[PDB]
Design a protein around this ligand. Structure first.
Ligand SMILES: CC(=O)N[C@@H]1[C@@H](O[C@@H]2OC(C(=O)O)=C[C@H](O)[C@H]2O)[C@@H](O)[C@@H](CO)O[C@H]1O
Length: 363
């Protein structure tokens, strides 16, 4: 069907599964709900259906009180991501509660611990460790804030975070990027010479390319990193696409090792690549010929990873559960779950960006 049809089916399925008080982890401000609700608000923009806006707003209002107060994990980049929902909520409502909450999250950057060259630790509990996922958790928010409040120092901050991750985790051979880097070389997964984790884990690279694809347009005009991030996205997408599965159109949990019998096709990473490829084409960062890769991914996604239940629920399966930096055997051993929120968010976002290219296919 058309991308938005599946996006609405998944969103309504999950909205029917959980009240906002249940949306897991329940009564917590966290990126799982933040990425799902980014999706639902994108869907609201695409369709104009107010129920999508209202559900997102109700989660925000569950967690943020009359004075803008919010409880969250104060050492985690992960806590910052859900702040992305605050910008459309504020824009629609002008309710200063949302800007107040946003400023609480933005104020976190100055409190977090850092590697020697300034890269944020993923959490206090992960000292000297940068994980690719954190570019999505902390980067787009910062640039939205920068534009809302005209704080150019946040442009500089995201430029630095990204350059450090790319400097330390990009593999020149494949062009893929390792999941995490430990400057201290204290974790068991840290390579003794480079500090990197050993594998290309699909979702983490997915968050990175989604981030680049979304952040370029938030930079000032003529900002030097417009060129840099475009170039970076182009090469990353070329690298990723080389590993697309020829039979299903999808990508593997461990991107470069799809021949391994204990590897498997994973949905959230695949949807993130679809998002970044569609977004890149839509914005002109990527050659339009990537549309075939994209539509092939779309066909396999639906065919192999989705279904409707006897009771009518739309199900996206084989989404990796929450996963840390680690080894091959740990990654391929991760639980494969259905309709997990970060994967549902990636699915819904992918569909909204795919919709225009689907509509115009052939023209
Ligand atoms: C420290 C630890 O491993 N905590 C577990 C959670 O992992 C953290 O949460 C996230 C995330 O997606 O929420 C991913 C990383 O694994 C890590 O930062 C999580 O895996 C959990 C089950 O949801 O169990 C915790 O013990």
């Amino acid at each position: 069907k058309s991308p938005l049809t599946y996006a609405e089916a998944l969103a309504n399925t999950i909205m029917n599964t959980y009240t906002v008080e249940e949306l897991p982890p329940a009564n917590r401000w966290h990126y799982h709900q933040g990425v799902f609700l980014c999706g639902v608000l994108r869907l609201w923009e695409a369709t104009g259906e107010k129920r999508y806006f209202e559900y997102a707003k109700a989660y925000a209002d569950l967690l943020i009180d009359d004075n803008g107060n919010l409880l969250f994990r104060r050492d985690e980049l992960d806590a910052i991501q859900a702040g992305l929902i605050l910008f459309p909520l504020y824009e629609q409502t002008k309710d200063e509660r949302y800007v107040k909450a946003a400023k609480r999250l933005r104020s976190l950057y100055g409190t977090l611990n850092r590697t020697s060259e300034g890269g944020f630790w993923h959490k206090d509990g992960y000292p000297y460790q940068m994980w690719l996922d954190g570019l999505y958790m902390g980067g787009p928010f910062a640039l939205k804030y920068a534009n809302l409040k005209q704080e150019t120092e946040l442009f500089d901050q995201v430029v630095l975070q990204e350059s450090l991750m790319r400097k330390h985790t990009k593999d020149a051979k494949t062009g893929l990027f390792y999941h995490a880097w430990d400057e201290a070389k204290k974790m068991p997964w840290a390579n003794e010479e480079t500090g990197c984790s050993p594998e290309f884990w699909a979702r983490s690279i997915g968050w990175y390319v989604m981030s680049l694809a979304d952040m370029i347009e938030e930079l000032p005009k003529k900002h030097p990193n417009r060129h840099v991030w475009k170039n970076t996205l182009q090469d990353m997408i070329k690298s990723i696409c080389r590993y697309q599965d020829k039979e299903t159109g999808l990508w593997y949990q461990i991107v470069d090792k799809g021949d391994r019998s204990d590897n498997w096709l994973e949905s959230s990473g695949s949807c993130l690549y679809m998002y970044a490829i569609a977004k890149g084409i839509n914005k002109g960062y990527l050659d339009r010929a990537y549309e075939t890769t994209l539509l092939k991914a779309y066909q396999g996604l639906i065919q192999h990873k989705t279904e409707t239940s006897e009771d009518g629920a739309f199900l996206v399966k084989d989404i990796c559960v929450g996963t840390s930096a680690g080894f091959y055997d740990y990654y391929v051993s991760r639980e494969r779950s259905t309709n997990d929120l970060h994967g549902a968010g990636a699915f819904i976002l992918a569909m909204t960006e795919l919709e225009p290219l689907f509509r115009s296919a052939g023209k």
